[PDB]
Amino acid sequence: NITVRFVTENDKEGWQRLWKSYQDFYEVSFPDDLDDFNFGRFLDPNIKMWAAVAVESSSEKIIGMINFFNHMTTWDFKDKIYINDLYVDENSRVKGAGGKLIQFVYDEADKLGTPSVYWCTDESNHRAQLLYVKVGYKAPKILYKRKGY
Amino acid sequence: DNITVRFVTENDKEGWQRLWKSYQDFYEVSFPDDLDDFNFGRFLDPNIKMWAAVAVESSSEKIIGMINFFNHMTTWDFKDKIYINDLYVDENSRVKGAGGKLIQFVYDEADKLGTPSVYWCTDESNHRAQLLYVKVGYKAPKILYKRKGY
Amino acid sequence: NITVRFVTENDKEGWQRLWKSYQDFYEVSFPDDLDDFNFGRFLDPNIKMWAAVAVESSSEKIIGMINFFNHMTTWDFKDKIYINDLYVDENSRVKGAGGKLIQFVYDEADKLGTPSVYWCTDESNHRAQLLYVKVGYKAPKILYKRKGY
Amino acid sequence: SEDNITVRFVTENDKEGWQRLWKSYQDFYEVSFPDDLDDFNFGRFLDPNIKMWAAVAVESSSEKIIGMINFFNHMTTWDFKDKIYINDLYVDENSRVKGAGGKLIQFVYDEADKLGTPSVYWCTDESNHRAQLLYVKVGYKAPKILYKRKGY
Ligand SMILES: CC(=O)SCCNC(=O)CCNC(=O)[C@H](O)C(C)(C)COP(=O)(O)OP(=O)(O)OC[C@H]1O[C@@H](n2cnc3c(N)ncnc32)[C@H](O)[C@@H]1OP(=O)(O)O
Ligand SMILES: CC(=O)SCCNC(=O)CCNC(=O)[C@H](O)C(C)(C)COP(=O)(O)OP(=O)(O)OC[C@H]1O[C@@H](n2cnc3c(N)ncnc32)[C@H](O)[C@@H]1OP(=O)(O)O
Numbered sequence: 001n002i003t004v005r006f007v008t009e010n011d012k013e014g015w016q017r018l019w020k021s022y023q024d025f026y027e028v029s030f031p032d033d034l035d036d037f038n039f040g041r042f043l044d045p046n047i048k049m050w051a052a053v054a055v056e057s058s059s060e061k062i063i064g065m066i067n068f069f070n071h072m073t074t075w076d077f078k079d080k081i082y083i084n085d086l087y088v089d090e091n092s093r094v095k096g097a098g099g100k101l102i103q104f105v106y107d108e109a110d111k112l113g114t115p116s117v118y119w120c121t122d123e124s125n126h127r128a129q130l131l132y133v134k135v136g137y138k139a140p141k142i143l144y145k146r147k148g149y
Numbered sequence: 150d151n152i153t154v155r156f157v158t159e160n161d162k163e164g165w166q167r168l169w170k171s172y173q174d175f176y177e178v179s180f181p182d183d184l185d186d187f188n189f190g191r192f193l194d195p196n197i198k199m200w201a202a203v204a205v206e207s208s209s210e211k212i213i214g215m216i217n218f219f220n221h222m223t224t225w226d227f228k229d230k231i232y233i234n235d236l237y238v239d240e241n242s243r244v245k246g247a248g249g250k251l252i253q254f255v256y257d258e259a260d261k262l263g264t265p266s267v268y269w270c271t272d273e274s275n276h277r278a279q280l281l282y283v284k285v286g287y288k289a290p291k292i293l294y295k296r297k298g299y
Numbered sequence: 300n301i302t303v304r305f306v307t308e309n310d311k312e313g314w315q316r317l318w319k320s321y322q323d324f325y326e327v328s329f330p331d332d333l334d335d336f337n338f339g340r341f342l343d344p345n346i347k348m349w350a351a352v353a354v355e356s357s358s359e360k361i362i363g364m365i366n367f368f369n370h371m372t373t374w375d376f377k378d379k380i381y382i383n384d385l386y387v388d389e390n391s392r393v394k395g396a397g398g399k400l401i402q403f404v405y406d407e408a409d410k411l412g413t414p415s416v417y418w419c420t421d422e423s424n425h426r427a428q429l430l431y432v433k434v435g436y437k438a439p440k441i442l443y444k445r446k447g448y
Numbered sequence: 449s450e451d452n453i454t455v456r457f458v459t460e461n462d463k464e465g466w467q468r469l470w471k472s473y474q475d476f477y478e479v480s481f482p483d484d485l486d487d488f489n490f491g492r493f494l495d496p497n498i499k500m501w502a503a504v505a506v507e508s509s510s511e512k513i514i515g516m517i518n519f520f521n522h523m524t525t526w527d528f529k530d531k532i533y534i535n536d537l538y539v540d541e542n543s544r545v546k547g548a549g550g551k552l553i554q555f556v557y558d559e560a561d562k563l564g565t566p567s568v569y570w571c572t573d574e575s576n577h578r579a580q581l582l583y584v585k586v587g588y589k590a591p592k593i594l595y596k597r598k599g600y
């Protein structure tokens with residue numbers, strides 16, 4: 001089966017492999033040092049930014065990642081948890097990994113006293129949304145960005 | 150123009166809280182009064198990256214607008230970004246440029262803070278607000294998902 | 300102040316005017332033959348395609364236009380009415396002409412036994428939706444078109 | 449291995465099967481139409497003087513019906529030619545992801561080409577990702593919002 005747990009120093013390699021695949025998916029290309037910057041934050045206990053990794057109990061191969069972080073809110077005393085990134089190996093999909101990755105964050109946020117978790121996806125991403133409508137719900141909102149950003 | 154924007158002061162509480170209450174009525178929600186103090190506390194604390202500004206009528210120092218924003222991380226960049234959480238202008242003070250000035254103020258401060266990436270989100274039914282947002286920004290092709298029950 | 304009514308032969312020039320302004324708004328260009336084709340169909344009683352016009356009761360200034368037609372549906376025995384076009388004079392806006400034009404269709408559709416009226420609009424058209432949200436409700440649906448069309 | 453499904457217009461003999469799918473389609477949409485409407489729709493499909501049609505997806509092996517697509521012709525003030533609207537589309541649960549859905553939409557495209565009315569369109573529920581997974585391949589999401597009269 002599959003299990004999810006926070007990344008360790010040893011998981012850096014498999015995480016970067018998924019991080020690259022993830023960038024390909026989005027058709028983007030981040031600076032190579034941003035990888036090192038992010039992992040540094042996941043490991044720094046004083047920075048509320050984490051990363052969990054899905055691993056197969058048999059092969060023990062890292063098959064999925066989920067990067068998330070904590071931030072404030074004017075609408076409540078408790079902070080919110082935002083899942084920034086989610087990615088499961090194209091060959092390890094539909095096995096329940098994405099769901100177990102999101103569920104892990106739910107459980108972790110509950111322990112942090114910040115259960116209110118949210119995230120966003122591109123509207124045309126129906127593959128991901130098949131999973132999203134099962135673990136959450138589409139907010140009737142529109143996102144606006146500053147021109148050029 | 151007779152409308153200027155500026156960060157809140159301890160003396161701007163009464164005005165900000167009134168708009169905060171009216172903002173709540175607009176959203177059909179109701180927050181505990183203790184949250185109003187916590188929010189204002191974070192605004193005033195220079196070491197907490199949560200700010201608030203007010204659109205002030207220059208004729209009379211009457212506060213007619215409110216905008217609450219805060220800084221937060223991102224896995225897509227080394228530097229953080231700004232999220233405009235709340236925006237509200239008095240009914241009698243609408244369509245005078247206050248809304249756009251409040252958003253520009255955040256834009257300017259974002260620039261000074263070295264975190265120019267500013268964003269926000271409105272209800273898909275709020276066309277009055279979007280009439281402005283479409284001029285000062287652009288609609289991102291994204292869908293927002295929330296954890297069930299939240 | 301403002302009254303709505305089905306177009307007549309004498310409303311041709313006043314209708315073609317708003318037609319062209321409506322075309323400018325959408326940034327498109329239809330041939331002049333379509334102006335005559337559509338208007339022909341409006342006047343022809345056999346064709347279930349209509350057009351109403353908002354007029355200033357003071358004078359006889361055509362300030363508004365609304366084109367609509369009847370079409371089938373598999374979801375009911377009763378046909379539906381689709382409001383294809385709607386344009387109010389740029390100087391006569393926020394007077395209630397739009398609301399009146401849509402209300403007129405509702406009443407005419409009811410007398411036809413086809414009360415189900417609907418229309419679509421650009422997602423970015425917040426000016427029109429400020430009105431639509433008052434006389435209608437946004438369906439939680441997404442429209443798709445054939446590639447190229 | 450290869451499925452091999454054939455798509456064709458309904459005949460009086462297809463009634464029983466089409467209706468079975470029509471009912472499942474309603475269960476999916478969580479609606480309930482009177483049995484009379486099923487008869488009316490089929491009546492219109494079979495009537496050549498009424499521009500409403502229905503095609504059905506059949507297995508090449510056994511002439512078992514596994515898919516359905518209901519569509520019709522209507523006017524438009526934006527062109528001389530009319531256009532086509534795919535009102536319904538359903539494929540049996542156990543016959544999905546085998547190319548049936550796409551073939552049905554493609555059949556409508558061809559018939560639209562033959563009729564002189566190539567402009568085909570449809571709409572789906574915003575939350576219907578299973579379907580849009582296919583629609584994005586055969587069509588494109590228009591930047592439009594659908595509005596209906598209150599109570600309807
Ligand atoms: C980052 C942002 O948040 S948005 C971008 C997210 N990332 C991506 O899109 C990257 C590319 N995609 C992926 O990595 C993956 O497809 C993900 C992460 C979107 C999903 O990961 P997966 O490991 O496949 O998730 P999971 O295993 O839970 O998916 C299976 C679920 O989808 C359902 N599903 C899949 N296909 C279908 C279909 N055709 N019809 C109905 N349900 C379907 C499954 O039935 C299942 O639901 P269930 O677990 O109750 O049975
Ligand atoms: C993230 C957020 O919190 S979402 C919710 C924001 N808050 C609300 O919606 C609360 C209720 N509404 C409000 O408080 C206000 O309507 C706001 C803040 C949304 C806008 O504030 P305002 O002070 O009225 O903004 P502003 O004066 O810039 O609005 C006018 C703008 O809308 C344009 N506009 C076009 N048509 C119209 C119309 N029919 N009515 C109003 N404005 C219109 C104006 O032309 C103008 O652009 P411009 O200044 O370049 O000419």
Ligand SMILES: CC(=O)SCCNC(=O)CCNC(=O)[C@H](O)C(C)(C)COP(=O)(O)OP(=O)(O)OC[C@H]1O[C@@H](n2cnc3c(N)ncnc32)[C@H](O)[C@@H]1OP(=O)(O)O
Pocket residue numbers: 277324382383384385386387388389391392393394395396397398399418419420421424426427428429430433
């Ligand atoms: C299907 C169609 O083809 S989609 C395209 C329709 N056409 C266009 O978009 C063309 C360009 N626009 C126009 O010609 C017009 O603006 C139209 C047709 C969209 C609307 O026509 P109008 O004559 O202005 O409509 P109407 O007079 O009813 O508009 C006033 C309504 O808008 C509301 N409204 C306008 N600005 C605001 C604002 N800032 N805040 C709240 N409500 C507002 C008014 O309150 C009012 O509602 P009410 O009549 O109950 O008081």
Ligand SMILES: CC(=O)SCCNC(=O)CCNC(=O)[C@H](O)C(C)(C)COP(=O)(O)OP(=O)(O)OC[C@H]1O[C@@H](n2cnc3c(N)ncnc32)[C@H](O)[C@@H]1OP(=O)(O)O
Pocket residue numbers: 127476534535536537538539540543544545546547548549550551570571572573576578579580581582585
């Ligand atoms: C207007 C309309 O009526 S709206 C409602 C349409 N009807 C419904 O939703 C009823 C319930 N659903 C159904 O009957 C079916 O699931 C339908 C009609 C939506 C689709 O019918 P199908 O016969 O399965 O379609 P089709 O065979 O083309 O589906 C396969 C396609 O989906 C894609 N797909 C399926 N599951 C996935 C997944 N998990 N990830 C990525 N792509 C996927 C396939 O890649 C494929 O594309 P391809 O053929 O180029 O390889």
